[PDB]
A paper describes a structure:
Islet amyloid polypeptide (IAPP, or amylin) is a 37-residue peptide hormone that is cosecreted with insulin and one of the most amyloid-prone sequences known. Overproduction and aggregation of IAPP leads to amyloid deposition in the islets of Langerhans, a pathological hallmark of type-2 diabetes. Although the precise link between IAPP aggregation and disease remains uncertain, IAPP aggregates have been shown to be toxic in cell-based assays, and genetic and animal studies implicate islet amyloid in the progressive loss of pancreatic β-cell function. Over 40 different proteins, with diverse native structures or in many cases intrinsic disorder, form amyloid associated with human disease, yet all amyloid fibrils share a common cross-β architecture consisting of a continuous intermolecular β-sheet supported by networks of zipper and ladder-like interactions. Amyloid fibrils have a similar cross-β architecture, but fibrils formed by a single protein sequence can have diverse structures, varying with time, self-assembly conditions, and sequence modifications.
Cryo-EM was performed on fibrils assembled from 30 μM IAPP in the same buffer used for kinetic assays (160 mM ammonium acetate, pH 7.4, 1% v/v DMSO), in the absence (4 replicates) or presence (2 replicates each) of 50 μM YX-I-1, canagliflozin, or doxazosin. Fibrils were imaged after 2 weeks, at which point fibril formation was at a steady state, as judged by analyzing aliquots with ThT. Following helical reconstruction, multiple distinct IAPP fibril polymorphs were resolved, revealing further detail on the apparent morphological differences between the samples. Thus, out of the fibril structures that were identified in each data set, YX-I-1 fibrils consisted of 89% C-fold subunits, whereas this subunit fold was absent from fibrils grown in the control or with doxazosin. By contrast, the control and doxazosin-treated samples consisted of L-fold (62% or 72%, respectively), U-fold (34% or 28%), and S-fold (4% or 0%) subunits. Attempts to solve the structure(s) of these assemblies using the fibril structures identified here for wild-type IAPP and previously for IAPP S20G22 as starting templates were also unsuccessful. Together, the cryo-EM data analysis demonstrates that YX-I-1 and canagliflozin direct IAPP assembly to amyloid architectures that are different from each other and those observed in the control or with doxazosin.
Residue numbers in the entry:
A (entry chain K), B (entry chain I), C (entry chain G), D (entry chain E), E (entry chain C), F (entry chain A), ...: 12 to 37
The structure:
Amino acid sequence: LANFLVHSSNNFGAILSSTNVGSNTY
Amino acid sequence: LANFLVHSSNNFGAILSSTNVGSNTY
Amino acid sequence: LANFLVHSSNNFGAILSSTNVGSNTY
Amino acid sequence: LANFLVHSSNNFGAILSSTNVGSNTY
Amino acid sequence: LANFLVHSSNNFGAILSSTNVGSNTY
Amino acid sequence: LANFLVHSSNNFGAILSSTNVGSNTY
Amino acid sequence: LANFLVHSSNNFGAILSSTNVGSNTY
Amino acid sequence: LANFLVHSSNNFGAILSSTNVGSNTY
Amino acid sequence: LANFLVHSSNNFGAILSSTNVGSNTY
Amino acid sequence: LANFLVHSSNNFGAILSSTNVGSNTY
Amino acid sequence: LANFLVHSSNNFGAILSSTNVGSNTY
Amino acid sequence: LANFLVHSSNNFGAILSSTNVGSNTY
């Protein structure tokens, strides 16, 4: 169980919240 | 169980919150 | 159980909060 | 149980808070 | 049980707070 | 039980606070 | 005379190219 | 005369190229 | 005359190339 | 005449290349 | 005439290449 | 004429290559 809370303002950069069970490339 | 709370403002850099069960490349 | 709290402002550098159960490359 | 609190401002360098149960490369 | 508190400003260098249960390479 | 408090400013060098239960390479 | 050439791909962080003749805040 | 060429890929951190004739705060 | 060439990949930290003729704060 | 070439990969720390003709604070 | 070439990988610490004609504080 | 070549890997400490024509404080 994963819980993500993201409160943001004036955001230019990328914000990434994720769960990668297996293989992933960014 | 993973809990992530991210409070941010005036953000330029990338903020990454994640869980990698297996293999991952950034 | 892992708990992450990140309060930030005026951030240029990358901020990474994560749990790597197995193999991971950054 | 791991608890991470990161309060930062004017940050250029990378800030990494993480738990590596097994093998990890940075 | 590990508790990490990092208060920083004007940071250029990398700040790493982590727990390595097993093998890890930086 | 390990407690880490790091108060820093104008930091260029890497600051590392960590607990290595087993094998670790830096 | 200022010349800026920015070739980028897969960009998450903010890329800023600018000329500040006088006072500026980021 | 200032010339800036920035070729980048897979960029997370902020990349700043700029000329500050007078006073500037980052 | 200042010439800047920056070739980068997999960049998390801030990369700053700049010319400060007068007073500047980072 | 100043020439800067910066080739980098897997960079967390801040990399600064600059020319300060007069007064500067970091 | 100053020439700077910086080839780096896996960098956490700040790398600074600069020319200070007059007064400078780091 | 000053030439600087810095090849580094796995660097935590600050590496500074610079030319100070006049007064400088670190």
